[PDB]
Design a binder for these strands. Structure first.
Lengths: 95, 96
DNA sequence: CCAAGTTTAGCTAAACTTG
DNA sequence: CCAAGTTTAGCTAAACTTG
């Protein structure tokens, strides 16, 4: 279901520390739409591996694909600092 | 360094998905102060595998709250605000 | 039902951080 | 420089979830 255009894929793999196999896997799956089973079959890899491989590149895209000048952060914080962050995301969701 | 008593360890392991070897390993370095290196030698393991096992028990205890006015927050912010949030988490990980 | 995809403890390699 | 510890991609297993 989840897929990436050619250019979104190129963005996601920009400087991403990842082997060439992982790149090929995600390319066939996210861009060319091939099932993950094919790379499991053809590479002799378990279903887990291929899925983790595609996941990295997808997560990479999600770590980008944010308005430039922004970044996603997550943490457990005190009630006060938790409150401030709540507001900041609201103000961020105005621009 | 980072160590635990028996009550904290029995609290750490409480509810954690974890085999028996990982409990052993963590008990040795967190509770009994034994180095991680000796556990690699006896169990025939790389340094990393032993380090992952310790971390899992240590993290579970650090994730046993304890001020729950605290809350898990996730947000998409500009870098200047993101930096502060990253700084805040880093304050929180020292204070605990 | 069947097939495919997800998830996570546990491992190694290996490069990196600490003291 | 070394020793001990940390980190993380990549892999399995196996139980779980989606289509």
């Amino acid at each position: 279901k989840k897929r990436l255009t050619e250019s979104q894929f190129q963005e996601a793999i920009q400087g991403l520390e990842v082997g060439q196999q992982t790149i090929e896997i995600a390319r066939g799956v996210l861009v060319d739409g091939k099932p993950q089973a094919t790379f499991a079959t053809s590479l002799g890899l378990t279903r887990g591996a291929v899925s983790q491989a595609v996941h990295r590149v997808w997560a990479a895209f999600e770590d980008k694909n944010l308005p430039e000048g922004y970044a996603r952060v997550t943490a457990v914080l005190p009630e006060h600092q938790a409150y401030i962050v709540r507001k900041w995301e609201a103000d961020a969701k105005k621009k």
